[PDB]
Write a protein that holds these residues in place. Structure first.
Motif, PDB file in Angstrom:
ATOM      1  N   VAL A  13      39.403  46.461  49.785  1.00 52.87           N
ATOM      2  CA  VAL A  13      38.019  45.642  50.377  1.00 52.87           C
ATOM      3  C   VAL A  13      36.927  46.685  50.568  1.00 52.87           C
ATOM      4  O   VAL A  13      36.266  47.210  51.538  1.00 52.87           O
ATOM      5  N   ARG A  14      36.482  47.120  49.120  1.00 48.26           N
ATOM      6  CA  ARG A  14      35.360  48.301  48.972  1.00 48.26           C
ATOM      7  C   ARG A  14      34.439  47.577  47.865  1.00 48.26           C
ATOM      8  O   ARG A  14      34.994  47.654  46.667  1.00 48.26           O
ATOM      9  N   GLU A  15      33.410  47.527  47.944  1.00 51.65           N
ATOM     10  CA  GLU A  15      32.474  46.914  47.189  1.00 51.65           C
ATOM     11  C   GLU A  15      32.085  47.927  46.284  1.00 51.65           C
ATOM     12  O   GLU A  15      31.116  48.868  46.259  1.00 51.65           O
ATOM     13  N   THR A  16      32.727  47.907  45.052  1.00 51.34           N
ATOM     14  CA  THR A  16      32.509  49.081  43.983  1.00 51.34           C
ATOM     15  C   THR A  16      31.885  48.251  42.834  1.00 51.34           C
ATOM     16  O   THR A  16      31.960  46.823  42.849  1.00 51.34           O
ATOM     17  N   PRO A  17      31.270  49.021  41.982  1.00 47.49           N
ATOM     18  CA  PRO A  17      30.717  48.203  40.528  1.00 47.49           C
ATOM     19  C   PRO A  17      31.823  47.845  39.638  1.00 47.49           C
ATOM     20  O   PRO A  17      33.083  48.423  39.807  1.00 47.49           O
ATOM     21  N   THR A  18      31.660  46.830  38.825  1.00 44.30           N
ATOM     22  CA  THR A  18      32.637  45.979  38.272  1.00 44.30           C
ATOM     23  C   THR A  18      33.080  46.944  36.816  1.00 44.30           C
ATOM     24  O   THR A  18      32.446  47.741  36.720  1.00 44.30           O
ATOM     25  N   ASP A  19      33.606  45.981  36.021  1.00 41.55           N
ATOM     26  CA  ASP A  19      33.891  46.542  34.766  1.00 41.55           C
ATOM     27  C   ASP A  19      33.098  46.017  33.488  1.00 41.55           C
ATOM     28  O   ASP A  19      33.364  46.822  32.645  1.00 41.55           O
ATOM     29  N   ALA A  20      32.266  44.995  33.717  1.00 42.88           N
ATOM     30  CA  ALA A  20      31.502  44.688  32.610  1.00 42.88           C
ATOM     31  C   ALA A  20      32.071  44.274  31.542  1.00 42.88           C
ATOM     32  O   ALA A  20      31.848  44.907  30.284  1.00 42.88           O
ATOM     33  N   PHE A  21      32.582  42.972  31.611  1.00 40.31           N
ATOM     34  CA  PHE A  21      33.586  42.725  30.252  1.00 40.31           C
ATOM     35  C   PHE A  21      32.588  41.950  29.296  1.00 40.31           C
ATOM     36  O   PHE A  21      31.417  41.955  29.435  1.00 40.31           O
ATOM     37  N   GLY A  22      33.161  41.776  28.197  1.00 40.37           N
ATOM     38  CA  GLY A  22      32.424  41.418  27.052  1.00 40.37           C
ATOM     39  C   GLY A  22      32.771  39.744  26.539  1.00 40.37           C
ATOM     40  O   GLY A  22      32.626  38.948  27.088  1.00 40.37           O
ATOM     41  N   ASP A  23      33.353  39.767  25.180  1.00 46.85           N
ATOM     42  CA  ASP A  23      33.732  38.477  24.692  1.00 46.85           C
ATOM     43  C   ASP A  23      35.241  38.596  24.080  1.00 46.85           C
ATOM     44  O   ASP A  23      35.692  39.832  23.859  1.00 46.85           O
ATOM     45  N   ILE A  24      35.865  37.485  23.978  1.00 45.31           N
ATOM     46  CA  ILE A  24      37.428  37.321  23.364  1.00 45.31           C
ATOM     47  C   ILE A  24      37.301  36.435  22.096  1.00 45.31           C
ATOM     48  O   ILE A  24      36.393  35.970  21.764  1.00 45.31           O
ATOM     49  N   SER A  25      38.379  36.875  21.406  1.00 45.91           N
ATOM     50  CA  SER A  25      38.946  35.653  20.397  1.00 45.91           C
ATOM     51  C   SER A  25      40.366  35.922  20.541  1.00 45.91           C
ATOM     52  O   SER A  25      40.919  37.013  20.582  1.00 45.91           O
ATOM     53  N   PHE A  26      41.215  34.905  20.210  1.00 45.73           N
ATOM     54  CA  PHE A  26      42.645  34.888  20.043  1.00 45.73           C
ATOM     55  C   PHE A  26      43.304  33.740  19.127  1.00 45.73           C
ATOM     56  O   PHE A  26      42.244  33.256  18.560  1.00 45.73           O
TER      57      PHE A  26
END
Length: 59
Positions: A13-26
């Motif tokens: 429970v520590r408010e850290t910055p996120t990983d900033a994800f992108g787009d997918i395809s599969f």
């Protein structure tokens, strides 16, 4: 662009910055890792800015 997402969105429970994800395809699909404690109007600005959707008629 996505550096704004990496600034505003957060990992939590520590408010850290996120990983900033992108787009997918599969075609393709987009994806963003947010935390449960995010602001509402911040979420609106993120949604209507980055994804940039038109006004829907019905949910």
């Amino acid at each position: 662009l996505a550096s704004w997402i990496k600034e505003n969105i957060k990992k939590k429970v520590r408010e850290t910055p996120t990983d900033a994800f992108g787009d997918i395809s599969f075609k393709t699909g987009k994806y963003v890792r947010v935390s449960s404690d995010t602001s509402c109007e911040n979420l609106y600005q993120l949604m209507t800015e980055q994804w940039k959707l038109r006004s829907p008629n019905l949910l």
